[PDB]
Design a protein around this motif. Structure first.
Motif, PDB file in Angstrom:
ATOM      1  N   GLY A 155      -2.862  22.283  10.621  1.00 20.97           N
ATOM      2  CA  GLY A 155      -3.711  21.217  10.136  1.00 20.97           C
ATOM      3  C   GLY A 155      -2.940  19.926   9.990  1.00 20.97           C
ATOM      4  N   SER A 156      -3.648  18.910   9.510  1.00 26.86           N
ATOM      5  CA  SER A 156      -3.164  17.541   9.419  1.00 26.86           C
ATOM      6  C   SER A 156      -3.212  17.132   7.952  1.00 26.86           C
ATOM      7  CB  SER A 156      -4.070  16.601  10.239  1.00 26.86           C
ATOM      8  OG  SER A 156      -3.567  15.277  10.245  1.00 26.86           O
ATOM      9  N   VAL A 157      -2.193  16.428   7.464  1.00 22.64           N
ATOM     10  CA  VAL A 157      -2.269  15.892   6.096  1.00 22.64           C
ATOM     11  C   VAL A 157      -1.462  14.596   6.041  1.00 22.64           C
ATOM     12  CG1 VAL A 157      -0.460  17.578   5.363  1.00 22.64           C
ATOM     13  CG2 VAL A 157      -1.763  16.297   3.589  1.00 22.64           C
ATOM     14  N   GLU A 158      -2.008  13.569   5.369  1.00 20.47           N
ATOM     15  CA  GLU A 158      -1.432  12.233   5.396  1.00 20.47           C
ATOM     16  C   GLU A 158      -1.575  11.584   4.029  1.00 20.47           C
ATOM     17  OE1 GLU A 158      -3.496  10.115   8.511  1.00 20.47           O
ATOM     18  OE2 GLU A 158      -2.901  11.625   9.984  1.00 20.47           O
ATOM     19  N   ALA A 159      -0.726  10.596   3.768  1.00 21.29           N
ATOM     20  CA  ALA A 159      -0.905   9.745   2.588  1.00 21.29           C
ATOM     21  C   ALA A 159      -2.178   8.939   2.773  1.00 21.29           C
ATOM     22  CB  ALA A 159       0.311   8.830   2.402  1.00 21.29           C
ATOM     23  N   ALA A 160      -3.094   9.038   1.813  1.00 21.65           N
ATOM     24  CA  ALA A 160      -4.414   8.428   1.928  1.00 21.65           C
ATOM     25  C   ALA A 160      -4.621   7.258   0.987  1.00 21.65           C
ATOM     26  CB  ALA A 160      -5.514   9.472   1.677  1.00 21.65           C
ATOM     27  N   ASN A 161      -4.060   7.286  -0.229  1.00 19.05           N
ATOM     28  CA  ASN A 161      -4.132   6.145  -1.125  1.00 19.05           C
ATOM     29  C   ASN A 161      -2.736   5.974  -1.713  1.00 19.05           C
ATOM     30  OD1 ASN A 161      -7.212   6.888  -3.089  1.00 19.05           O
ATOM     31  ND2 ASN A 161      -7.061   6.341  -0.915  1.00 19.05           N
ATOM     32  N   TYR A 162      -2.169   4.775  -1.607  1.00 23.40           N
ATOM     33  CA  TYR A 162      -1.002   4.398  -2.424  1.00 23.40           C
ATOM     34  C   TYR A 162      -1.577   3.662  -3.615  1.00 23.40           C
ATOM     35  CZ  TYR A 162       1.451   5.451   1.955  1.00 23.40           C
ATOM     36  OH  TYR A 162       1.985   6.070   3.050  1.00 23.40           O
ATOM     37  N   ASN A 163      -1.634   4.320  -4.774  1.00 20.47           N
ATOM     38  CA  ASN A 163      -2.386   3.728  -5.862  1.00 20.47           C
ATOM     39  C   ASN A 163      -1.507   3.004  -6.857  1.00 20.47           C
ATOM     40  OD1 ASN A 163      -4.882   4.323  -4.921  1.00 20.47           O
ATOM     41  ND2 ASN A 163      -5.137   6.206  -6.084  1.00 20.47           N
ATOM     42  N   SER A 164      -0.341   3.568  -7.139  1.00 19.81           N
ATOM     43  CA  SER A 164       0.664   2.898  -7.974  1.00 19.81           C
ATOM     44  C   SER A 164       1.980   3.581  -7.654  1.00 19.81           C
ATOM     45  CB  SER A 164       0.304   2.962  -9.464  1.00 19.81           C
ATOM     46  OG  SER A 164       0.389   4.269  -9.991  1.00 19.81           O
ATOM     47  N   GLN A 256      -3.779   0.642   0.860  1.00 13.87           N
ATOM     48  CA  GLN A 256      -2.504   0.056   0.405  1.00 13.87           C
ATOM     49  C   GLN A 256      -2.688  -0.644  -0.950  1.00 13.87           C
ATOM     50  OE1 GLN A 256       0.468   0.511   1.917  1.00 13.87           O
ATOM     51  NE2 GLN A 256      -0.235   1.352   3.910  1.00 13.87           N
ATOM     52  N   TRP A 257      -3.080   0.127  -1.964  1.00 17.95           N
ATOM     53  CA  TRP A 257      -3.412  -0.490  -3.246  1.00 17.95           C
ATOM     54  C   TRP A 257      -2.171  -0.945  -4.003  1.00 17.95           C
ATOM     55  CZ3 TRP A 257      -7.788  -2.585  -4.284  1.00 17.95           C
ATOM     56  CH2 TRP A 257      -8.076  -2.997  -5.612  1.00 17.95           C
ATOM     57  N   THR A 258      -1.089  -0.160  -3.957  1.00 13.65           N
ATOM     58  CA  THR A 258       0.157  -0.587  -4.616  1.00 13.65           C
ATOM     59  C   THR A 258       0.605  -1.940  -4.080  1.00 13.65           C
ATOM     60  OG1 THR A 258       0.796   1.707  -4.935  1.00 13.65           O
ATOM     61  CG2 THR A 258       2.548   0.062  -5.166  1.00 13.65           C
ATOM     62  N   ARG A 259       0.573  -2.094  -2.758  1.00 11.75           N
ATOM     63  CA  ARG A 259       0.977  -3.351  -2.139  1.00 11.75           C
ATOM     64  C   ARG A 259      -0.031  -4.439  -2.427  1.00 11.75           C
ATOM     65  NH1 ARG A 259       2.519  -1.417   3.820  1.00 11.75           N
ATOM     66  NH2 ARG A 259       0.971  -3.090   4.161  1.00 11.75           N
ATOM     67  N   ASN A 283      -6.583   0.902 -15.393  1.00 12.58           N
ATOM     68  CA  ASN A 283      -5.447   1.740 -15.744  1.00 12.58           C
ATOM     69  C   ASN A 283      -4.383   1.750 -14.662  1.00 12.58           C
ATOM     70  OD1 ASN A 283      -7.259   2.186 -17.746  1.00 12.58           O
ATOM     71  ND2 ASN A 283      -7.014   4.426 -17.779  1.00 12.58           N
ATOM     72  N   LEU A 284      -4.747   1.441 -13.426  1.00  9.22           N
ATOM     73  CA  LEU A 284      -3.756   1.254 -12.379  1.00  9.22           C
ATOM     74  C   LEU A 284      -3.065  -0.094 -12.472  1.00  9.22           C
ATOM     75  CD1 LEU A 284      -5.390   2.783  -9.092  1.00  9.22           C
ATOM     76  CD2 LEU A 284      -3.326   3.576 -10.353  1.00  9.22           C
ATOM     77  N   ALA A 285      -3.572  -1.010 -13.307  1.00  6.01           N
ATOM     78  CA  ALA A 285      -3.104  -2.390 -13.360  1.00  6.01           C
ATOM     79  C   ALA A 285      -2.362  -2.736 -14.638  1.00  6.01           C
ATOM     80  CB  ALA A 285      -4.272  -3.370 -13.217  1.00  6.01           C
ATOM     81  N   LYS A 286      -2.633  -2.029 -15.728  1.00  5.20           N
ATOM     82  CA  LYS A 286      -1.786  -2.106 -16.909  1.00  5.20           C
ATOM     83  C   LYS A 286      -0.667  -1.086 -16.757  1.00  5.20           C
ATOM     84  CE  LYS A 286      -4.828  -0.651 -19.401  1.00  5.20           C
ATOM     85  NZ  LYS A 286      -5.472  -0.116 -20.633  1.00  5.20           N
ATOM     86  N   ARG A 287       0.565  -1.605 -16.699  1.00  6.82           N
ATOM     87  CA  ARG A 287       1.857  -0.979 -16.427  1.00  6.82           C
ATOM     88  C   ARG A 287       2.517  -1.812 -15.337  1.00  6.82           C
ATOM     89  NH1 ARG A 287       2.542   5.374 -15.203  1.00  6.82           N
ATOM     90  NH2 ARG A 287       1.686   5.865 -17.271  1.00  6.82           N
ATOM     91  N   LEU A 288       1.771  -2.803 -14.794  1.00 12.99           N
ATOM     92  CA  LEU A 288       2.359  -3.712 -13.819  1.00 12.99           C
ATOM     93  C   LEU A 288       3.104  -4.834 -14.538  1.00 12.99           C
ATOM     94  CD1 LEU A 288      -0.255  -3.873 -11.107  1.00 12.99           C
ATOM     95  CD2 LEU A 288       1.695  -2.339 -11.443  1.00 12.99           C
ATOM     96  N   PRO A 289       4.295  -5.201 -14.061  1.00  9.16           N
ATOM     97  CA  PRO A 289       5.156  -6.096 -14.862  1.00  9.16           C
ATOM     98  C   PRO A 289       4.636  -7.516 -15.006  1.00  9.16           C
ATOM     99  CG  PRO A 289       6.152  -5.551 -12.729  1.00  9.16           C
ATOM    100  CD  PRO A 289       5.020  -4.610 -12.925  1.00  9.16           C
TER     101      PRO A 289
END
Length: 314
Positions: A155-164, A256-259, A283-289
């Motif tokens: 099978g196939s498996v890939e990075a799908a969301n870079y969230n943080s 590419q959410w982290t970027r 919650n993905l955005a609080k912890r960003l510097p």
């Protein structure tokens, strides 16, 4: 025109039964937004949102969420909110951003993302695809794990969301996703299965993306009046041709959410408003510097508080 504030629009998983119900009692514009989208589609999107009947089937989730997002956008602007400097949305939310930015009408987009959901649902046979969250590893490490498991032929498996940083969602064949989860845990990371069956944002979606592209190619799109950072490249299109190309590639490539959040901060964005139900992107955005504060505008009190705070900071 807010100089230090960006709007982010959430995607699948942010829906919840009863969402916006309080805000709709107080503001008739909410129910008007839902009736307009429901007219485009031919079925009652507010009923899905309030009963939950079908809410979690993505051909319904996507137009319900996009409509909810645009309802709150319209209310924010109506109550005197400032226009953000940039927009970005997570997967389905990219289409919500394009509506908010005048690039597509509510009616065209709610139809388009209803189609997007239908095609995604049919991309692989039920049970053959999965998604999972890998926690605690760098992006390149998750990619390497996925590449190695994919090379086993199973099978196939890939990075799908870079969230943080440290939070990567993978997608692909169910057994291959399970294998990466196991190897991540063996290498001292954490891994949890997500409650979806559609392996979005991986190569298993390429046939569905090809079908969707035929519809997308014949849809009217204008350049947004507020720049939209797009998922496939964390970039802002110069052409309509570039905007369309990034949309056409979005479904089968990583989000590419982290970027995206890095790019916003590198532009002086310091406040984020999550324009939709829930608090996922908050919650993905609080912890960003460089992000001072992140707001959801889900309720009467959240909306006025975010209206106030952004007006003060700007």
């Amino acid at each position: 025109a807010a100089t230090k504030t960006a709007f982010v629009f959430p995607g699948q998983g942010s829906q919840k039964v009863g969402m916006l119900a309080e805000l709709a009692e107080q503001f008739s514009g909410v129910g008007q937004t839902f009736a307009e989208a429901s007219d485009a589609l031919g079925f009652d999107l507010w009923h899905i949102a309030q009963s939950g009947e079908g809410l979690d089937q993505t051909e319904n989730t996507q137009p319900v969420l996009l409509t909810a997002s645009i309802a709150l956008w319209r209310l924010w602007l109506d109550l005197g909110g400032l226009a953000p400097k940039y927009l970005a949305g997570h997967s389905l939310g990219e289409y919500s951003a394009l509506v908010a930015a005048g690039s597509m009408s509510l009616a065209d987009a709610v139809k388009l993302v209803n189609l997007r959901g239908k095609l995604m649902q049919n991309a692989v046979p039920q049970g053959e695809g999965a998604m999972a969250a890998i926690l605690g590893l760098a992006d390149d490490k998750v990619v390497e794990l996925c590449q190695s498991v994919s090379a086993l032929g199973q099978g196939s498996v890939e990075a799908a969301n870079y969230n943080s940083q440290g939070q990567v969602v993978i997608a692909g064949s169910t057994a291959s996703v399970q294998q990466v989860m196991a190897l991540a845990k063996e290498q001292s990371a954490k891994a949890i299965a997500l409650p979806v069956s559609v392996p979005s944002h991986c190569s298993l979606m390429k046939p569905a993306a090809e079908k969707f592209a035929e519809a997308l190619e014949q849809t009217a799109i204008e350049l947004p009046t507020i720049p939209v950072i797009q998922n496939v490249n964390a970039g802002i299109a110069t052409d309509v041709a570039q905007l369309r190309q990034a949309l056409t590639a979005q479904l089968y490539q990583s989000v590419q959410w982290t970027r995206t959040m890095q790019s916003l901060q590198d532009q002086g964005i310091q406040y984020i408003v999550e324009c939709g139900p829930g608090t996922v992107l908050s919650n993905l955005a609080k912890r960003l510097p460089n992000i001072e504060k992140a707001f959801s505008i889900d309720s009467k009190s959240k909306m006025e508080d975010a209206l106030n705070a952004v007006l003060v900071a700007a």
